[PDB]
Amino acid sequence: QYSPNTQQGRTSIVHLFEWRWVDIALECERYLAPKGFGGVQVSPPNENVAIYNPFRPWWERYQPVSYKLCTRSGNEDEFRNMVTRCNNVGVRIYVDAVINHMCGNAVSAGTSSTCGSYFNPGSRDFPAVPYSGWDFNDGKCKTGSGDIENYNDATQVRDCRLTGLLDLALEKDYVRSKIAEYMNHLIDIGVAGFRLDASKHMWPGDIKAILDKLHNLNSNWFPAGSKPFIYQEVIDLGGEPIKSSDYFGNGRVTEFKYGAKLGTVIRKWNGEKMSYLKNWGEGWGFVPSDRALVFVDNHDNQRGHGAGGASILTFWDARLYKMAVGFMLAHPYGFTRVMSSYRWPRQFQNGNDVNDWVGPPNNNGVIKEVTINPDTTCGNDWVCEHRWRQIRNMVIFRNVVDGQPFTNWYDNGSNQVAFGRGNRGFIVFNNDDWSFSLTLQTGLPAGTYCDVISGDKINGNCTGIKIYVSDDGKAHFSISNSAEDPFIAIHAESKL
Ligand SMILES: *[C@@H]1O[C@H](CO)[C@@H](O)[C@H](O)[C@H]1NC(C)=O
Ligand SMILES: OC[C@H]1N/C(=N\O)[C@H](O)[C@@H](O)[C@@H]1O
Ligand SMILES: [Ca+2]
Ligand SMILES: [Cl-]
């Protein structure tokens, strides 16, 4: 249950946030498969409320109306087509499962849904599922408002409404069955696993009951006995009665402390320095590596909607972001998820982005397709971080060094550090305000290696910086604090 089910040799998944199924299918074939990406986390594929005020925000997809595969990303046929094509090329699909709640209790009854399904929040009526008033925790929640009021009370955090979202009575067999019916439909379609949205707001035991109802993966693509990959979104930064460890029996958990701390260290906030990353991992109080799903930023906190705060690094901070992602992909801790976003007009007022609700690039509500520019970058406002040379090459770096131990660590007591992965790869970082020029032990076999951050290895030649490793495994590295990308990475496959 803790295995990603990716193809051997592929070690990361990418979140193609708000992408259309047709665009993801093409991407699997033209880019993801060729570049060695393990899989894709897709946005919720089930019908949601169509919110027009504000105009179609990204968060409307976290307010379910039914389990019909019909959204702004596409319909069920397009969804199945995407899963099939991606699987045939060795790229897995992971579904964002929104199973803790339905839509806001204050949402107007009617057919303002992505598939026209009728729903009535007021009377707890969702005929397309179907769910009724007997299927929600209204009578179970003990708060005066019916919403979660105090996170220090583990009970209301689970039984009450998260900011007004109707809370499903997950203890009922009927509700558990409708949810499992939905998930098994996806499993039989070919998905390899799920991101359980808002797991903190569900009892570990209720999740387990649901998981016990799931089938094994589609035997047309996976070996018999394969279980779906499960990673639960649990925000645990300490200081709360709920611990992410309470969920280890169901699968992996999102380690939000990872990005929050990496961000403060790289930004060099309050005395933090990269030299302190020598014992990065459990040594920093993180969950066990084999139970962790790590990432620098996620769809919520890159726009200040989750946990991590102002320390979180995103594509907006391009230079430092590439460094954080590089460190993450080079370090052996956890299973890595790469973010792929779209640009929106950030409008800061009193320290807060008033346009944090803006949905994906669109034409009157219809999501724009991902266009590919001649330099492999994307158009139509899709950022496509997964296509940035520095990030794409580190995704490959992780595959190449998979299994190799963390070794040959070096640091200058400040912000210039380096380390290798067995004898398959080596990486160097310079985050100090002065240049780095030193000869280091890399542990790599003698030869000429192409730096994969500044360039590529194309037809027996390097398009960027070249590194020369001597017989003793030593090599000289020179990185100016003025370099566009203040770090260098070389591996077994970038060797000339
Ligand atoms: C490497 O690049 C040089 C030009 O810089 C060229 O002369 C040479 O043929 C290239 N090597 C290969 C193997 O293509
Ligand atoms: O930040 C509040 C809440 N909001 C959420 N999404 O908007 C998360 O699913 C949940 O884990 C988090 O605790
Ligand atoms: Ca709940
Ligand atoms: Cl997440």
From Swiss-Prot:
UniProt name for this protein: Pancreatic alpha-amylase
Q: Which compartments is it annotated to reside in? A: Secreted, Extracellular space
Q: How is the quaternary structure described?
A: Monomer. Binds to the sea anemone inhibitor helianthamide.
Disulfide linkage = C28-C86, C70-C115, C141-C160, C378-C384, C450-C462
Biological-process GO terms, alphabetical: carbohydrate catabolic process; carbohydrate metabolic process; polysaccharide digestion
What organism, scientifically named, is this protein from? Homo sapiens (Human)
| PANTHER family recorded | ALPHA-AMYLASE
Q: What is the effect of changing R337A?
A: Abolishes chloride binding; has only slight effect on activity
- Pfam families xref list: Alpha-amylase, Alpha-amylase_C
The entry's note on the tissues where this protein occurs is:
Detected in pancreas (at protein level).
Residues with PTM Pyrrolidone carboxylic acid: Q1
Q: What are the alphabetically sorted keywords of the record?
A: Calcium, Carbohydrate metabolism, Chloride, Disulfide bond, Glycoprotein, Glycosidase, Hydrolase, Metal-binding, Pyrrolidone carboxylic acid, Secreted, Signal
Q: Which GO terms describe its cellular component?
A: extracellular exosome; extracellular region; extracellular space
Q: What are its E.C. numbers? A: 3.2.1.1
Q: Which cofactor does it need?
A: Ca(2+); chloride
Q: What InterPro entries does the record tag this protein with?
A: A-amylase/branching_C, A-amylase_C, Alpha_amylase, Glyco_hydro_13_cat_dom, Glyco_hydro_b, Glycoside_hydrolase_SF
Question: What are the binding positions for Ca(2+) in this chain?
Answer: N100, R158, D167, H201
Q: Looking at the record's lineage, which domain of life comes first?
A: Eukaryota
The reaction(s) catalysed by this protein are: Endohydrolysis of (1->4)-alpha-D-glucosidic linkages in polysaccharides containing three or more (1->4)-alpha-linked D-glucose units
| Family the UniProt entry places it in | Belongs to the glycosyl hydrolase 13 family.
> What does the entry's cofactor note say about binding and number?
Binds 1 Ca(2+) ion per subunit. Binds 1 Cl(-) ion per subunit.
Q: According to its UniProt record, which residues of this chain constitute the active site?
A: D197 (nucleophile), E233 (proton donor)
Instruction: List residue numbers at the site (Transition state stabilizer).
Output: D300
Q: Where does chloride bind?
A: R195, N298, R337
Residues carrying sugar: N461
